[PDB]
Design a protein around this ligand. Sequence first.
Ligand SMILES: *[C@@H]1O[C@H](CO)[C@@H](O)[C@H](O)[C@H]1NC(C)=O
Ligand SMILES: NC[C@H](CC(=O)O)c1ccc(Cl)cc1
Lengths: 408, 408
Amino acid sequence: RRAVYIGALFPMSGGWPGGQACQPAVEMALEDVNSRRDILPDYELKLIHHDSKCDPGQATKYLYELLYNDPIKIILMPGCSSVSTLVAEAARMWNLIVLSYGSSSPALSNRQRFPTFFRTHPSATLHNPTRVKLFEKWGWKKIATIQQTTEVFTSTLDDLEERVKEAGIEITFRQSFFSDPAVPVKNLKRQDARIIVGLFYETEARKVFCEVYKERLFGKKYVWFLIGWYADNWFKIYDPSINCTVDEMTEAVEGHITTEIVMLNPANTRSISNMTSQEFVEKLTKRLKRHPEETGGFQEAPLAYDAIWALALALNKTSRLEDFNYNNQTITDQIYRAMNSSSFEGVSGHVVFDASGSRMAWTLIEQLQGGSYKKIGYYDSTKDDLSWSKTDKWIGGSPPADDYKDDD
Amino acid sequence: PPSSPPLSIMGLMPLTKEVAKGSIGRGVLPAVELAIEQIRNESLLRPYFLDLRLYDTECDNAKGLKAFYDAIKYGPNHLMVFGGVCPSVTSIIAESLQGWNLVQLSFAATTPVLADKKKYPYFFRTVPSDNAVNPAILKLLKHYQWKRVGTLTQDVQRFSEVRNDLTGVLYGEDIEISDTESFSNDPCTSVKKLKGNDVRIILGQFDQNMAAKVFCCAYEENMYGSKYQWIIPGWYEPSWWECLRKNLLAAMEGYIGVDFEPLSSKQIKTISGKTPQQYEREYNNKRSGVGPSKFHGYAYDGIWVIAKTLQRAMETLHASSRHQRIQDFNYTDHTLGRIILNAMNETNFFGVTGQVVFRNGERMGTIKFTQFQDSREVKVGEYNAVADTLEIINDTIRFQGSEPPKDD
Ligand SMILES: *[C@@H]1O[C@H](CO)[C@@H](O)[C@H](O)[C@H]1NC(C)=O
Ligand SMILES: NC[C@H](CC(=O)O)c1ccc(Cl)cc1
């Protein structure tokens, strides 16, 4: 039983604190893969990890330590989009495969730029057909966008621009910010923008909605579309960078719509690990120190679990693992081919790897009502199926317009 | 001298003939050599010598990161980083500096987000950044009594950040931004909106490729001539323009470009005892198999910044302990990084690019105004940030009308 090492980065804080649940999910998967005689009988999968803090600057220090210190690692496993973009761009220099469990950046689908990269997390492009379906449902042809300038968001908006153009919908106003959304939000108010797509991490979302409160860019005529990956009480958290109180934030966020991806199989079937989606959740909850609602990365945890299985199966097919070096393409090419041909059933459903989208068909749509998220529907872009709960609520009983229509 | 100890510096820049921006690195090396030559002849750092090691970034994220990592693993104990030319490479290095307690000085990276001291605390630059144009434009607007402006911004981080910075510069000043317009790939819709709002003075922030599209839309909309003033970035390649060419030229006539000033216009003796004019001639005499680089003066002054910082880092009556701490440096000493950071923060001398002083790691320098006049960019003015003064060159700047355009 030779040792085989994974160099992994887990974000315990920062933009997306996904490591909080994904690190225990990875440890659960490694135990299961190791205690399986039929998978890698002649090898033991070992984890060497660090807290990236969802920060490329801090990940750069840990990437150095992983690469320039023994033992040699056969694969790198980053979480966040910014960290995965940095390690996937750099990895070719060390002929290393990069497997992300958490990176949604659409730009990561670029095989020329990221030639050794795989991910179990779907591309963020999956939110865009759902946003378009809802714009059509609610009859909107004029949308505004506001994004924080991390490439995950900018590349999502590049994809949205293509999808809206195809549907005969226009982005009539765009604003971007690196850290301070004060000017973008003031400009959205002055332009009389109504339907707004806002792409940013939870930390920046608080800064945005404090400016939204101040500018009165909320109420009956405004509809905000956000990413559904934030903590359920995100707008209620004390934040020294914002002057707005909890009650002011709560009223600014009222009625907004969110989209997220369904990452856990909703059917009660048993996957390759012989677990059902429901037992995986109880098992992960058994490992956690805080409740699921209090742990970052809980919804993404099945992807972390399945990434270890995907790697274990790919290593099994290639079988000479102790002989991997950073100067040799041979073993890299073989594991790349095994990963490329992956096809198994995981806790997140049918696991396959093809660059552009990253598989699975469903998004979950929620609306914030009275300070709490309520499920309002699901959308499957492959079969064009919008499953609607009829639980959405609007001031006056119906959504607003995308603009005034009465100036003859 | 064999007994003279080295003060090692990690030089990072593109040098190879394989990459286009290799010409920048190769172009500044005669300026660097002249500064090093004089500093040694003067033995300003006695008994030490400045040991600049060069590492090729090849203007590539992956090669740049590996060049940095390899310099750490295999090179001498570098005290600071000198360089970073290509913005994406510079950002990767600059955000990670704290991991190795390294202060960085760039002579060519101008993108605005590098001014963020939360993300890049250990980063300094001798070159005025893209945001440095905004206080200069304010003085130009006051000079011609332009109180109402429109803005046209490409929805990309380096441009939206300059535009967001503009609001803060104009605040408390009596200048209205009557219309803010942004575009991703087609400025024509935004140009049409500016025309519709009767904007006369336009502040543009967009790349070289988009500029030709912008002026083609201005031509189609008749947004040029005696009634209009376009003020755009001045850092485009010379003859970037070379719509039919004649129509493009009619719309471009009289546009004002804003960029940093390559060398000081003052005939005063700098820290080297040479005037900027005498330095310029010695630079052209020293360079042999390379074209000139517009950043050569910034690189020359950059070496003087490093030498003065090192001299200050050694100014203590705890001499033997300070010399021992310098000898012992192996990237882990937070105290030495702090000593160097504080010393660089105190920089204040007259360089070939004018008074060299920093404000939160950003250069307080000189901004040059140009005006497009018949397929030639004519220098028309200079703005000095320390004095906050604008000097318009007599008999250069011209207006198509009998008077400069009115803002309404
Ligand atoms: C950096 O220099 C500025 C300007 O002289 C000064 O106000 C500031 O205190 C310095 N920073 C330190 C010593 O931390
Ligand atoms: N679902 C995890 C993913 C992480 C990432 O792509 O950095 C994510 C994407 C977007 C947001 Cl706003 C928060 C998290």
